[PDB]
Amino acid sequence: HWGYGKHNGPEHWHKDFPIAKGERQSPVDIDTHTAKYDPSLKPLSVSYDQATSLRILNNGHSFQVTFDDSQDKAVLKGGPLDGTYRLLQFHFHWGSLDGQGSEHTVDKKKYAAELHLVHWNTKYGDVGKAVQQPDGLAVLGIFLKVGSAKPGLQKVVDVLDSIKTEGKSADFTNFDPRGLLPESLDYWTYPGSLTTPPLAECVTWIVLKEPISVSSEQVLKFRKLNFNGEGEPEELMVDNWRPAQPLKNRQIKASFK
């Protein structure tokens, strides 16, 4: 059904998911001169020391690394958030060439890729319930530019050949997501949505100002993945990003001056 091609891509999604044309859709362009510095915003608290990664999976739209979210082991707190959000999974969006791939943009600039660390609010008990609430999820977004390699990404890229096609998964234990984070936790924040179906308007977005650098060899491995299942015509998993959506009645706030 839905995907990123001409006949099933972002321009078509509203037919099955009418909230695609809603009031708080993501991603958006971050206009840095219009974002308001908010001195009342707290530093982000990222507590990933006890993270337990479980599996890595090709779901036909990205690859994701899933974590044990049955306890408060890897949590996001502080920043614009009230309460505690458990890390469920991370995944990426990327392009066919380095000049596109990110979902959020910064002054209309596109990065080569964007990492999403997906967390849900423990007050709702499970992610399915959280997706039905306006403060249900917090997604930490991190831009990728191409240059030097990111050592903490290498364990991920080295197993991608084992999950080439839709439906494949593998053990992916003892992965430390702290190795994917930039130095600074300075961020922009705004109320938005999931960027893939169901496009639910349940996300507090926290987008880091500082990109991480990854090497061309690392991104090339992303681009060898397939949208298709094994045995179906090969279609490279590239350009799996939704473009910027209308900001409408929203304010983007900055944690930094």
Ligand SMILES: Cc1ccccc1-c1ccc(S(N)(=O)=O)cc1
């Ligand atoms: C939370 C969720 C539940 C069921 C199906 C898809 C999702 C999901 C999670 C994260 C994103 S994003 N790309 O906004 O980080 C999109 C959908």
Ligand SMILES: [Zn+2]
């Ligand atoms: Zn995403």
